């Protein structure tokens, strides 16, 4: 016995010490206050319907080179700007300005990957054609 009184009547005091020390993890503290329901631009959501303003680019750190051609997209359901990323090669000519886009996360749960800072979010679908079906091209590109 090291601390934690084992006594059979004592079940309250080592339940409160259990629940107090429950507030130290990196996932329980964020499920307790609803981190995706007050903070966190995705409203508890794997996806959000987006609309792009225009194109930009963000550079990679040390050690590498080759600025990665990001995108600045605001969101419909909350109305605020955010930066994103197109994980692909080419096809940024295919995604236009001021048209519908549909984006998601990385699985990295925020906390941008290792390469480019301050970018959490990646592009799944633009105007309804899902550009992974455009890079490995077998699809309509519609009349704009």
């Amino acid at each position: 016995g090291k601390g934690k009184p084992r006594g059979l009547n004592s079940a309250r005091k080592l339940r409160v010490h259990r629940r107090n020390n429950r507030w130290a993890e990196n996932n329980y503290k964020k499920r307790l206050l609803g981190t995706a329901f007050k903070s966190s631009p995705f409203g508890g959501s794997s996806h959000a319907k987006g609309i792009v303003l225009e194109k930009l680019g963000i550079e990679s750190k040390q050690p590498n080179s080759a600025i990665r051609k990001c995108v600045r997209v605001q969101l419909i359901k909350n109305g605020k700007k955010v930066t994103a990323f197109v994980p692909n090669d080419g096809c940024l000519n295919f995604v236009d300005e001021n048209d519908e886009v549909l984006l998601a996360g990385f699985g990295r749960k925020g906390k941008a990957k290792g390469d480019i800072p301050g970018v959490r979010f990646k592009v799944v679908k633009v105007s309804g054609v899902s550009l992974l079906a455009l890079w490995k091209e077998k699809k309509e590109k519609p009349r704009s």
Binding site: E59, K69, G90, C91
Partner: protein, 60 residues
Amino acid sequence: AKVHGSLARAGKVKSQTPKVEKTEKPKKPKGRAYKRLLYTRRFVNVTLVNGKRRMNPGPS
């Protein structure tokens, strides 16, 4: 570097790679008969070791 994603750098460097086409193999079997090849190739039609086994020995 506010305008530094200048699109003269783009998928251009991919597009300056040449365009070719796949050659046409016969019909690979689809189903159990594909694995009928795959077991008998790995564990019956083998006579090679090179240590223990080497399944796709690219040209050494």
